[PDB]
């Protein structure tokens, strides 16, 4: 059913649905689409914060694999999406093998079941203290965190638009008018896993 969340102002207080999509399937298809939207949003917001850290030259005061010789300093010297191509070859393995573990746990170990059948989409709270290693929300009421989830969805959509704009500007020059030309944002415009494959 298209009651859900994400429907509010600046869209007519109704579902934004030119193409069917929402009615392409049933209730479980909507839950999968909402989980994809929320995960996509969260990944885009994280990518935006990381990209802002990369542009402002905020790197760790460490070494990042002294055997290879790569350091944190010359990972910030190059532009975005080229730094990932220089993260040795074991580091991509470790970042990856960490992330499927989280994906497999976030789908499997639900006491209520997958988000399509029992349990709201975008809720890996069964992974204890994964979302909140400190408290942060610990005394917030339910009516507060519903509005916070709505803000989460809106900021996720905006971050998706922003990271698409950043990728387009790094790939095709002149795509984004406000970006136009920039000292940074100079690179391949995309990152393959493990550099070349």
């Amino acid at each position: 059913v298209e009651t859900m969340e994400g429907v509010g102002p600046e869209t007519g207080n109704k579902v934004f649905d030119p193409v069917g999509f929402a009615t392409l399937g049933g209730d479980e298809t909507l839950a999968f689409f909402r989980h994809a939207e929320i995960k996509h949003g969260r990944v885009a917001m994280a990518a935006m914060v990381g990209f802002l850290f990369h542009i402002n030259h905020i790197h760790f005061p460490g070494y990042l694999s002294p055997t290879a010789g790569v350091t944190f300093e010359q990972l910030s010297a190059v532009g975005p999406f080229e730094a990932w191509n220089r993260i040795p070859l074991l580091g991509q393995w470790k970042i990856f093998w960490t992330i499927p573990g989280l994906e497999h746990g976030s789908e499997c170990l639900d006491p209520a079941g997958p988000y399509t059948k029992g349990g709201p989409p975008g809720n890996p709270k069964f992974l204890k203290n994964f979302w909140d290693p400190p408290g942060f929300p610990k005394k917030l009421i339910e009516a507060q965190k519903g509005e916070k989830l709505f803000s989460n969805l809106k900021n996720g959509r905006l971050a998706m638009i922003g990271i698409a704009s950043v990728c387009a500007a790094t790939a095709v020059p002149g795509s984004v008018p406000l970006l136009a030309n920039a000292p940074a944002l100079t690179g391949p415009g995309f990152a393959l896993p493990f550099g070349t494959f």
Binding site: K14, P177, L178, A180, A182, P183
Partner: protein
């Protein structure tokens, strides 16, 4: 409802002329939404075109005469002679894109339903007043003033005064559209406007293709600014 209101507005605007619809545009469903939505969309389009044309005529006079602004320091420093059309051909592409984005934001705020239900109005093609715009709705950033009446100097007007103002706005917008189109035609094809012969120069570019070959990068920022 819509046809009778259109006929009454046409009679009020010009008692001699009345309704002048040679193409029959008041009876064609443009998007299959009956005749009320089509008539409301046509009325809103006429009002918006007239308002934009009056603003364009005033800006044409101001720019062709040449004028600075408050502080300026950049907008009135680049060109000396502009000949109207080339005034929007030497400003930065970022400035023109931001002006277009602000116009689009204003249009989206005008057409929004959440900004209309809060203000107690409806859409122009769903049984509402064509040309009405929301004041500030609720955008967190508190607007210092509204858009329709910036100083709130027209909050005591009677409904007859509002109707007379709407009719006068439509007629003056039509006249300003004729004047602006005549000036644009004289800027391209000489001899079109007989009164405006020689007043305006000739431009090789097209004013109907928006973002032309763009202006400079125009960094225009200082005090520790690394880009525009």
């Amino acid at each position: 409802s819509a046809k009778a209101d259109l006929e009454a507005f046409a009679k009020e605007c010009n008692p001699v002329v009345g309704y002048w619809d040679p193409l029959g545009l008041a009876d064609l469903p443009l998007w299959g939404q009956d005749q009320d939505a089509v008539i409301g969309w046509l009325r809103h389009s006429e009002i918006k075109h007239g308002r934009i044309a009056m603003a364009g005529f005033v800006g044409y006079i101001a720019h062709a005469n040449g004028f600075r602004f408050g502080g300026i320091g950049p907008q009135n420093v680049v060109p000396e002679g502009a000949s109207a059309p080339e005034v929007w051909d030497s400003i930065p592409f970022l400035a023109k894109l931001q002006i277009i984005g602000a116009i689009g934001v204003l249009e989206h705020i005008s057409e929004d339903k959440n900004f209309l239900a809060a203000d107690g109005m409806k859409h122009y093609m769903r049984g509402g007043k064509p040309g009405y715009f929301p004041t500030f709705s609720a955008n967190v950033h508190p607007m210092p003033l509204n858009l329709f009446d910036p100083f709130k100097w027209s909050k005591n007007a009677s409904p007859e005064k509002k109707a007379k103002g709407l009719v006068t706005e439509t007629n003056n917008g039509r006249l300003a559209m004729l004047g602006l189109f005549g000036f644009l035609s004289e800027s391209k094809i000489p001899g079109s406007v007989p009164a405006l012969s020689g007043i305006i120069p000739s431009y090789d570019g097209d004013y109907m293709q928006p973002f032309l070959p763009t202006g400079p990068d125009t960094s225009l920022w200082t005090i520790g600014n690394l880009w525009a």
